[PDB]
Design a protein around this ligand. Sequence first.
Ligand SMILES: CN(CCF)C(=O)c1cnn(C)c1C(=O)Nc1ccn2nc(-c3ccccc3)nc2c1
Ligand SMILES: [Mg+2]
Ligand SMILES: [Zn+2]
Length: 313
Amino acid sequence: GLMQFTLPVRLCKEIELFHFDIGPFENMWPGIFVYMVHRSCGTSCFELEKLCRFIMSVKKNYRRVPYHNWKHAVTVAHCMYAILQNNHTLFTDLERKGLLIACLCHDLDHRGFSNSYLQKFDHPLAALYSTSTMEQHHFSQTVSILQLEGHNIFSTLSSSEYEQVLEIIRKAIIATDLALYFGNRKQLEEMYQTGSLNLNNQSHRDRVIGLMMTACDLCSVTKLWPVTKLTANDIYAEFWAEGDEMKKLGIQPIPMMDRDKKDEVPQGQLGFYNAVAIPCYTTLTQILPPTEPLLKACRDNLSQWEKVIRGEE
Ligand SMILES: CN(CCF)C(=O)c1cnn(C)c1C(=O)Nc1ccn2nc(-c3ccccc3)nc2c1
Ligand SMILES: [Mg+2]
Ligand SMILES: [Zn+2]
């Protein structure tokens, strides 16, 4: 109390932009997160001692995989922060509180494998959670960490405020299951077009917060081209390892996961931008107009993948 986090000038300003890159200095990421909570939620949302202890236990439970790591957690929270700060007055006090935490926690204890690999390996998590296998695990890890002594950042909330925030976080985290995204965006499309979209309807906020989660989760496609391209390398490093593991189980992996089919990456990025990213950011921009720079940067990065195919890089 009276203790602002502040950042150096270039970060203080660039952090407000959608395309911000949190940088290679790991020891600055926790401070970057606290700075975003303090400015998004207020310096009174969380007891600093408890928040710091929660952040460090969350960090310790991300693994050293090439993509689904602690840098991803904080990257997906920064995007969510930019959305919240550019749409200040559309979100409740409890939403602003839950959603950044949801983003920090959304991939907790990920191992670098798809729900499909879990299910074909017959991993124990695939018997406990038949659909959204990893995403039910991530929420489960969030509640475990919140119940450690000194880790309950939500202590000051009423019984009912506490239940509403754990439920915002659960739905936020489940929505990051891209299998759920296609149906969620189709329904959001129809509802905005027929004019039936209603932000007082809790089931409508739910869908809208779910789309925000998919947008933040995919936010490597909204960065400066060299961030986009270099993150892609991490992303394939996991897909190809998964593919290698599929081959070990006696299963031909999908092309996306086969390191033998590297040559086709450019065209696979095009499919993903056209089938997933662009429609995601299009529908999001319709509903929250100030998110348009996510759409515009996604478009620039698609045209960069096109250039790759055309031999221009
Ligand atoms: C993390 N994640 C999934 C969670 F693990 C993602 O989808 C995700 C998030 N951000 N970005 C950029 C990605 C991503 O690149 N997605 C995709 C999605 C489909 N294809 N198909 C190919 C391909 C197909 C045939 C031949 C070669 C390649 N390549 C991709 C790449
Ligand atoms: Mg995930
Ligand atoms: Zn993620």
